[PDB]
C-alpha cells in the first residue's frame, strides 16, 4: 500500500580516529521521523548492538561515553572519548513507520594503524634479566638473555644458573617467572603492557602448590632501546622432600588460560596451572598475579590470557636452558548480541541456484519468545544493513520490505520458541548474511543472531 519513502543518511561515510578523540557522526530522514530513531555498532564478523533508541536513550550495559539527541529529522551520535573497544560500523535506524530502514553506515578507521604504539615496543625485542632467590632455603641466581616478538606473542629466552647450581628443585615451577608485553592483543582489546613502556610495570605473584608448597615472586620490568630488562625475585618453601619438586618428577606446564581483571585500579590475573609428572598424574597450583604500570594506563575489561610455556632444550642439571613462551588475549564467552540474557542462533543458510528456494529458521531461548515481536534483517557481502520482514508477537499481522515482498514469508512457532523465513524465486540481490532480532516497543532491535549465510550462485 501507499507508504512513506524514508531514505536515512549519514555522515560522514568513514573517517579516521584516535583513541581519546570525540567522534560525532549524525543522519538525516527525508520526511520527519519523531524521535524514534536508533543507533547500532556494528563491529567486523559481529551482529549489530544496539546502543542508543529514541535518539537518545541508552541501552543497558552501554558506557556514558556514548550519547544521542535529535527530533525531526536530523540526529546525532556522539562518543566523547574514543577507546579502542569503539571502532565499528554504526548504523541508525527508523521505527516510525514501516518499511524499517537503516542508515547506510558509518565506518571508523584506526588512524595511523598502530603506528604510535610500534616506536615504542618494536616488532622484535630483546630480554635481559636476572632472578635471584632461594627454594627450601636453597640460596641461587640465573640470569638469561632472550629474543621476542611482542606483537605475536612469543619469545624464547636462554637461562643459566650462575650460583646455586646444581639446583635442588625442579626447574619448572621457576620458569613462569621469566612478562606480558609478550602477548599478541586483538584491536578491541586495550593492550595494558604495551601502553605501560617506555616507563614499565611490575607484577607481584603468589603460587600456591596443592601439597603446600608455597612460591612468591615479584619482577621490575623496564625497557631502554629494543631490549626489555627484568630483576626477579623468587622464593619458595614447604616443598615436602618427596613431593615432585624436591625429587624433579615434573615433566611440563599444561597449557593455561588466566583470567585478567581489574580492582583496586590495577590489573590481576588468576590462573589454575598444572605440572605434568612422570607417570602421568598432575601436580596443581594457583597462581595470583597483580600487575601494576608505573603510569597511568588504559584499564581494559575482563579477558583471558591462553598461554603455553616449554623448555626446548637443557643440560643435565638445567644450568643450561632454552626456554619458550607463546600467549595470546581474547574474550571467553564465546557474533552475535543483546542487551540482556536471551541468545538466538540462526540456521539454513546455504548454497542455492538463482529461482531457488531456501528456508531460514532461528530458535530462541532464555526469555518468553511469544511476548515479543520480531524481525530478519540481511547484509549483502560489503554492504550495509537491510530491513527484510516482520511479525507481531502472535503471528498475525506481518509486514515486508518491497525487495521480497510477494518472494519471502515470515512466520512463527511460539510453542517452539522459533521464527522462519521462507524464500522463494532467490536472486543474486538476496545472497547475504540473514540475521534474526528481537523488536522492541522502543524501536529498538536489542537481540540478534551471529546471523547465517545465504548463497545464490549458478555454473
Same mark, same amino acid.
Given at each position: 500500500?501507499?507508504?512513506?519513502?524514508?531514505?536515512?543518511?549519514?555522515?560522514?561515510?568513514?573517517?579516521?580516529?584516535?583513541?581519546?578523540?570525540?567522534?560525532?557522526?549524525?543522519?538525516?530522514?527525508?520526511?520527519?521521523?519523531?524521535?524514534?530513531?536508533?543507533?547500532?555498532?556494528?563491529?567486523?564478523?559481529?551482529?549489530?548492538?544496539?546502543?542508543?533508541?529514541?535518539?537518545?536513550?541508552?541501552?543497558?550495559?552501554?558506557?556514558?561515553?556514548?550519547?544521542?539527541?535529535?527530533?525531526?529529522?536530523?540526529?546525532?551520535?556522539?562518543?566523547?572519548?574514543?577507546?579502542?573497544?569503539?571502532?565499528?560500523?554504526?548504523?541508525?535506524?527508523?521505527?516510525?513507520?514501516?518499511?524499517?530502514?537503516? %542508515?547506510?553506515?558509518?565506518?571508523?578507521?584506526?588512524?595511523?594503524?598502530?603506528?604510535?604504539?610500534?616506536?615504542?615496543?618494536?616488532?622484535? =625485542?630483546?630480554?635481559?634479566?636476572?632472578?635471584? %632467590?632461594?627454594?627450601?632455603?636453597?640460596?641461587?641466581?640465573?640470569?638469561?638473555?632472550?629474543?621476542?616478538?611482542?606483537?605475536?606473542?612469543?619469545?624464547?629466552?636462554?637461562?643459566?644458573?650462575?650460583?646455586?647450581?646444581?639446583?635442588?628443585?625442579?626447574?619448572?615451577?621457576?620458569?613462569?617467572?621469566?612478562?606480558?608485553?609478550?602477548?599478541?592483543?586483538?584491536?578491541?582489546?586495550?593492550?595494558?603492557?604495551?601502553?605501560?613502556?617506555? @616507563?614499565?610495570?611490575?607484577?607481584?605473584?603468589?603460587?600456591?602448590?596443592?601439597?603446600?608448597?608455597?612460591?612468591?615472586?615479584?619482577?621490575?620490568?623496564?625497557?631502554?632501546?629494543?631490549?626489555?630488562?627484568?630483576?626477579?625475585?623468587?622464593?619458595?618453601?614447604?616443598?615436602?622432600?618427596?613431593?615432585?619438586? =624436591?625429587?624433579?618428577?615434573?615433566?611440563?606446564?599444561?597449557?593455561?588460560?588466566?583470567? =585478567?581483571?581489574?580492582?583496586?585500579?590495577?590489573?590481576?590475573?588468576?590462573?589454575?596451572?598444572?605440572?605434568?609428572?612422570? %607417570?602421568?598424574?598432575?601436580?596443581?597450583?594457583?597462581?595470583?598475579?597483580?600487575?601494576?604500570?608505573?603510569?597511568?594506563?588504559?584499564?581494559?575489561?575482563?579477558?583471558?590470557?591462553?598461554?603455553?610455556?616449554?623448555?626446548?632444550?637443557?643440560?643435565?642439571?638445567?644450568?643450561?636452558?632454552?626456554?619458550? @613462551?607463546?600467549?595470546?588475549?581474547?574474550?571467553?564467552?564465546?557474533?552475535?548480541?543483546?542487551?540482556?540474557?536471551?541468545?538466538?542462533?540462526?540456521?539454513?543458510?546455504?548454497?542455492?541456484?538463482?529461482?531457488?528456494?531456501?528456508?531460514?529458521?532461528?530458535?530462541?531461548?532464555?526469555?518468553?519468545?511469544?511476548?515479543?515481536?520480531?524481525?530478519?534483517?540481511?547484509?549483502?557481502?560489503?554492504?550495509?544493513? @537491510?530491513?527484510?520482514?516482520?511479525?507481531?508477537?502472535?503471528?498475525?499481522?506481518?509486514?515486508?520490505?518491497?525487495?521480497?515482498?510477494?518472494?519471502?514469508?515470515?512466520?512463527?512457532?511460539?510453542?517452539?520458541?522459533?521464527?522462519?523465513?521462507?524464500?522463494?524465486?532467490?536472486?543474486?540481490?538476496?545472497?547475504?548474511?540473514?540475521?534474526?532480532?528481537?523488536?522492541?516497543?522502543?524501536?529498538?532491535?536489542?537481540?540478534?543472531?551471529?546471523?547465517?549465510?545465504?548463497?545464490?550462485?549458478?555454473?
Amino acid at each position: 500500500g501507499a507508504h512513506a519513502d524514508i531514505q536515512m543518511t549519514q555522515s560522514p561515510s568513514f573517517l579516521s580516529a584516535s583513541v581519546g578523540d570525540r567522534v560525532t557522526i549524525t543522519c538525516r530522514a527525508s520526511q520527519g521521523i519523531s524521535s524514534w530513531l536508533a543507533w547500532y555498532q556494528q563491529k567486523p564478523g559481529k551482529a549489530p548492538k544496539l546502543l542508543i533508541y529514541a535518539a537518545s536513550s541508552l541501552q543497558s550495559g552501554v558506557p556514558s561515553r556514548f550519547s544521542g539527541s535529535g527530533s525531526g529529522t536530523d540526529f546525532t551520535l556522539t562518543i566523547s572519548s574514543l577507546q579502542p573497544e569503539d571502532f565499528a560500523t554504526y548504523y541508525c535506524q527508523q521505527a516510525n513507520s514501516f518499511p524499517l530502514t537503516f %542508515g547506510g553506515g558509518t565506518r571508523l578507521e584506526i588512524k595511523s594503524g598502530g603506528s604510535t604504539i610500534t616506536s615504542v615496543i618494536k616488532p622484535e =625485542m630483546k630480554i635481559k634479566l636476572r632472578m635471584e %632467590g632461594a627454594v627450601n632455603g636453597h640460596k641461587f641466581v640465573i640470569e638469561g638473555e632472550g629474543i621476542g616478538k611482542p606483537y605475536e606473542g612469543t619469545q624464547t629466552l636462554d637461562l643459566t644458573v650462575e650460583e646455586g647450581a646444581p639446583l635442588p628443585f625442579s626447574y619448572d615451577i621457576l620458569t613462569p617467572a621469566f612478562n606480558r608485553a609478550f602477548t599478541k592483543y586483538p584491536e578491541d582489546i586495550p593492550d595494558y603492557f604495551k601502553q605501560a613502556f617506555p @616507563e614499565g610495570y611490575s607484577w607481584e605473584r603468589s603460587m600456591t602448590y596443592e601439597d603446600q608448597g608455597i612460591c612468591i615472586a615479584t619482577s621490575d620490568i623496564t625497557m631502554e632501546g629494543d631490549c626489555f630488562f627484568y630483576e626477579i625475585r623468587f622464593d619458595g618453601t614447604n616443598f615436602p622432600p618427596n613431593g615432585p619438586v =624436591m625429587q624433579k618428577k615434573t615433566l611440563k606446564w599444561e597449557p593455561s588460560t588466566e583470567k =585478567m581483571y581489574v580492582e583496586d585500579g590495577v590489573l590481576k590475573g588468576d590462573v589454575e596451572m598444572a605440572l605434568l609428572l612422570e %607417570g602421568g598424574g598432575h601436580y596443581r597450583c594457583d597462581f595470583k598475579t597483580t600487575y601494576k604500570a608505573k603510569k597511568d594506563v588504559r584499564l581494559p575489561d575482563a579477558h583471558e590470557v591462553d598461554h603455553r610455556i616449554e623448555i626446548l632444550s637443557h643440560d643435565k642439571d638445567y644450568n643450561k636452558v632454552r626456554l619458550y @613462551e607463546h600467549a595470546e588475549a581474547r574474550y571467553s564467552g564465546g557474533g552475535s548480541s543483546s542487551g540482556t540474557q536471551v541468545q538466538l542462533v540462526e540456521s539454513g543458510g546455504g548454497l542455492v541456484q538463482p529461482g531457488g528456494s531456501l528456508r531460514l529458521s532461528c530458535a530462541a531461548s532464555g526469555l518468553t519468545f511469544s511476548n515479543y515481536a520480531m524481525n530478519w534483517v540481511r547484509q549483502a557481502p560489503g554492504k550495509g544493513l @537491510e530491513w527484510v520482514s516482520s511479525i507481531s508477537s502472535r503471528g498475525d499481522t506481518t509486514y515486508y520490505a518491497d525487495s521480497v515482498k510477494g518472494r519471502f514469508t515470515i512466520s512463527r512457532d511460539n510453542s517452539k520458541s522459533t521464527l522462519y523465513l521462507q524464500m522463494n524465486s532467490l536472486r543474486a540481490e538476496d545472497a547475504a548474511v540473514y540475521y534474526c532480532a528481537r523488536l522492541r516497543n522502543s524501536g529498538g532491535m536489542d537481540v540478534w543472531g551471529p546471523g547465517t549465510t545465504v548463497t545464490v550462485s549458478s555454473a
